[PDB]
């Protein structure tokens, strides 16, 4: 149930990867590890490559991820969102805050490599 | 009926926007395309919402792209008159905390510095 996550610094770009289902049950875990790995004026890409699914308390992590990258001057790229989670993000239209592509590869063009 | 009633005016620098309905699929669109455009660029935005029973995901929706956008002009806005049933429904999803409320005309204005 919990998520595995890894994080590293290449370039002063912080990858945040997860593993598993944003559960309600496994989302707070999550969120106390993302939230303190945000850099002022930072740049951070999320892989969501094998992140399977989100409820509403996962979904609930990324807008709180996104509230402080914003507020924090930073930059913020979703990597591999699943055709479900954005379709499901589009509705909510909390889509419209977040830059994504599918690659880590366009990821960093993005961000400056 | 299913269309909103929206007025839109300004108070001594303050836009106020008040809105009598629901915003579901149908309702949304006019609300957003009228209320959207009148945020000004470093402005101040007064969105009264007392007499709104509810919104669909659309409408929430409607409250979202006034968020976003009124950041693009770097600008104010304060709800006021937020239903607990509709205040909920933005705590599912932590929406709500992209807000600023009140219950009263006043604290806003004072929220926003008037008289």
Known sequence: ???????RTEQGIDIITLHGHLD?????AVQAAVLPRV????????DLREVSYMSS?????LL?????????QGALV???????????????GFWNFF???ASMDE???ILGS
Do not use: F
């Not at 149930?1 to 994080?7: G, L, P, S, V, W």
């Not at 308390?57 to 992590?61: E, F, H, N, P, Q």
């Open 107 to 109: 990821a960093l063009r």
């Open 39 to 46: 850099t002022a004026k930072g740049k951070m890409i999320l």
């Open 24 to 28: 309600t049950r496994s989302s707070p």
């Open 57 to 61: 308390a996962g979904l609930r992590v």
């Open 64 to 72: 709180s991820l996104y509230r402080h990258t914003s507020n924090q």
């Open 1 to 7: 149930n919990a998520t595995d996550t890894q994080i």
């Open 78 to 92: 979703l990597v591999g969102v699943s055709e479900e989670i954005r379709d499901t993000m589009e509705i909510t």
């Open 99 to 101: 830059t994504a592509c």
